[PDB]
Amino acid sequence: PSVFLFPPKPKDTLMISRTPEVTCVVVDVSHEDPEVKFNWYVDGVEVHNAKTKPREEQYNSTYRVVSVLTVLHQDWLNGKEYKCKVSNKALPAPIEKTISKAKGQPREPQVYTLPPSRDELTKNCVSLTCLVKGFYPCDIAVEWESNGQPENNYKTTPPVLDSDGSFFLYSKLTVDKSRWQQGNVFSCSVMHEALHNHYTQKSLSL
Amino acid sequence: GPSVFLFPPKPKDTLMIRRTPEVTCVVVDVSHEDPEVKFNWYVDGVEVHNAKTKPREEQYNSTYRVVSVLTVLHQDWLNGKEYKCKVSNKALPAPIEKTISKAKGQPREPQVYTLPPSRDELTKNCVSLTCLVKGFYPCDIAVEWESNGQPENNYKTTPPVLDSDGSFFLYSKLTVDKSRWQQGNVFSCSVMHEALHNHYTQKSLSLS
Ligand SMILES: *[C@@H]1O[C@H](CO[C@@H]2O[C@@H](C)[C@@H](O)[C@@H](O)[C@@H]2O)[C@@H](O[C@@H]2O[C@H](CO)[C@@H](O[C@@H]3O[C@H](CO[C@H]4O[C@H](CO)[C@@H](O)[C@H](O)[C@@H]4O[C@@H]4O[C@H](CO)[C@@H](O)[C@H](O)[C@H]4NC(C)=O)[C@@H](O)[C@H](O[C@H]4O[C@H](CO)[C@@H](O)[C@H](O)[C@@H]4O[C@@H]4O[C@H](CO)[C@@H](O)[C@H](O)[C@H]4NC(C)=O)[C@@H]3O)[C@H](O)[C@H]2NC(C)=O)[C@H](O)[C@H]1NC(C)=O
Ligand SMILES: *[C@@H]1O[C@H](CO[C@@H]2O[C@@H](C)[C@@H](O)[C@@H](O)[C@@H]2O)[C@@H](O[C@@H]2O[C@H](CO)[C@@H](O[C@@H]3O[C@H](CO[C@H]4O[C@H](CO)[C@@H](O[C@@H]5O[C@H](CO)[C@@H](O)[C@H](O)[C@H]5NC(C)=O)[C@H](O)[C@@H]4O)[C@@H](O)[C@H](O[C@H]4O[C@H](CO)[C@@H](O[C@@H]5O[C@H](CO)[C@@H](O)[C@H](O)[C@H]5NC(C)=O)[C@H](O)[C@@H]4O)[C@@H]3O)[C@H](O)[C@H]2NC(C)=O)[C@H](O)[C@H]1NC(C)=O
């Protein structure tokens, strides 16, 4: 049995209204000796907030067991380590994994909206570009909205390490050229721990 | 125990006849108990024997790492031929086969758009030059920046990202002194893709 530990989603940790969680997924759980125990420690201190989820089956006759631990927003943002100890007798080794936020000084993201190029106006749909650069850590959330209504036809590139040690990304919202030249205003909403109120908003219009 | 990893040719290699594209079959975790591994190569089923196997090099973890390199024809890879590397070892319950090929599907011509720096960014000393390449298929592509026929070499390119229409898009960002951009220098975004004429195109960008 091999374990894969996952971090909380960036949006969950930045808004107090949401609940961030650390996901500990055991993937090679076997029918024999399926007693997969879960002990959780924050900064080495055992905590009892976890809730193991029901198992799942696959096409390779292998079970999947997941334990979900709710985490405090500041605990993750302060860098505290989370250790997922998996106690299963399927294999002798008591596999243990640790997770933590990336260490280092958070750097404020820079948000620049870029209008579509003149060459793209030939096409029936144009591309609205949102450039976010100079942020650290890579944990970030980017969304698009217009008139207080979220847009859905956007894709965000994964964060990429830059020369200066910071991260950058692009978010591309694709809309009909009619909407663009009708004068509609679109906004790129960026959430990051180094932002004031963990949120900034840049607008783009004709 | 032994593990096999198959690597595709670099996108620039397959797109230029001048360069030599190749497929690398890397075997790790080769113990001294059975240090001899066999590389058998197949191309769409037919067994080929122009592969050059490198001598077994032992690593510091008492594990051997053997590598075989198969030179592939540019047209063969672009016609979707499948390259299979069969690795045989006496410490293996069964010989391990790995297959690599160009992403199956219909090629899509990339659209190249150069985007000027934001006016808000002009307050800085370094400005960002953006090259949007979208609507291409498959993933294999190369993006480079140059000015005055000389590589800029101060740019970072995002990975290809699967768009909603099934194609791929990416952004390449070139960081340049705000003095150079305002000085009037013209920079060009070079994109190499199989669905491009001569597998090459250039879109330029300058203060307008
Ligand atoms: C003993 O040591 C050796 C190495 O020794 C070395 O030298 C000695 C002297 C010491 O100093 C060592 O410290 C030193 O490391 C160990 O060999 C390693 O073994 C591991 C696995 O156990 C391999 O990991 C894999 O890596 C590949 C990528 O490898 C490229 O990038 C590496 C960057 O570090 C580079 O080192 C590699 O050489 C290789 O680089 C490429 O080389 C080719 C050669 O021609 C070149 O053309 C390329 O340009 C070049 N690229 C770059 C960027 O430089 C990685 O792909 C593997 O991940 C896949 O597999 C995982 C499961 O194995 C899986 O979890 C991943 O998600 C991923 O899964 C795959 O994903 C793809 C795409 O999504 C998908 O299509 C596949 O289906 C999927 N496959 C699956 C799921 O199976 C993996 O991480 C190391 O590369 C290897 N190091 C080497 C070969 O140098 C050896 O393991 C040690 N002994 C023991 C017992 O562990
Ligand atoms: C029986 O079948 C099961 C079902 O899976 C089948 O097989 C799969 C291959 C798929 O084809 C699937 O469709 C099939 O149904 C098997 O379970 C799977 O087993 C494999 C192999 O063990 C696991 O593969 C790993 O995946 C890791 C990523 O997780 C993936 O799954 C999750 C859940 O679906 C995806 O989504 C994530 O979900 C989280 C909640 O659980 C959520 O919180 C998170 O936000 C979300 N993320 C995203 C992006 O959506 C996720 O996207 C993946 O798809 C992957 O990381 C593994 O590769 C890496 O492994 C390590 C760990 O990252 C990495 O090394 C690390 O690098 C770091 C630097 O980057 C270092 O800092 C670390 O120190 C270092 N750690 C080390 C070295 O230990 C490696 O370099 C490598 O890159 C790996 O690919 C599957 O997760 C698992 N589950 C599923 C659903 O597929 C089962 O194994 C089978 N039985 C047997 C016996 O094999």
Numbering used by the authors:
A (entry chain A): 238 to 443
B (entry chain B): 237 to 444
Any passages from the paper?
ADCs uniquely combine the target-specificity and extended half-life of antibodies with the potent cytotoxicity of small-molecule chemotherapeutic payloads. Given the foundational research on its site-specific conjugates, we use as a model ADC the well-studied Her2 receptor-targeting antibody trastuzumab conjugated with a cleavable Ala-Ala p-aminobenzyloxycarbonyl (PABC) linker to the potent antimitotic payload monomethyl auristatin E (MMAE). Methods: In this work, we present the crystal structures of trastuzumab Fab and Fc domains site-specifically conjugated with a cleavable linker–payload. Results: Our findings suggest that pockets within both Fab and Fc regions may interact with and shield the linker portion of the conjugate.
To optimize structural studies, both hinge-containing and hinge-free Fc constructs were assessed; the hinge-free construct was ultimately selected because it consistently produced higher-quality crystals and enabled data collection at improved resolution. Distinct positive Fo-Fc electron density was detected at the engineered cysteine residues Q362C and S375C, though the signal intensity varied between the two sites. At the more solvent-exposed Q362C conjugation site, the 2Fo-Fc density was sufficient only to model the conjugated maleimide moiety of the linker–payload. In contrast, the 2Fo-Fc density at the S375C site, located in the central pocket of the Fc dimer, was sufficient to model the majority of the Ala-Ala-PABC linker in one Fc monomer. Notably, the second monomer showed limited linker density, likely reflecting increased linker–payload flexibility and indicating weaker interactions at this site. Detailed examination of the structure reveals two canonical hydrogen bonds: one between the linker NH and the backbone carbonyl of P296 and another between the linker carbamate and the main chain amide of L398. The maleimide group forms a hydrogen bond with the carboxyl side chain of D376 and a van der Waals interaction with the D376 backbone, which may help stabilize the maleimide in this non-hydrolyzed form. Several nonpolar residues surrounding the S375C site including P396, L398, V397 and F404 contribute to a buried surface area of 244 Å2, including a specific van der Waals interaction between F404 and the first alanine methyl group on the linker. Consistent with the ambiguous linker density at the S375C site, LCMS analysis of the conjugated Fc reveals a mass shift of 18 or 36 Da, indicating that maleimide hydrolysis occurs at one or both S375C sites of the Fc. Maleimide hydrolysis involves an opening of the maleimide ring, enhancing conjugation stability by preventing the retro-Michael reaction that would release the conjugate altogether. This hydrolysis suggests that the density observed in the S375C structure likely represents a mixture of hydrolyzed and non-hydrolyzed maleimide linker–payloads conjugated to C375.
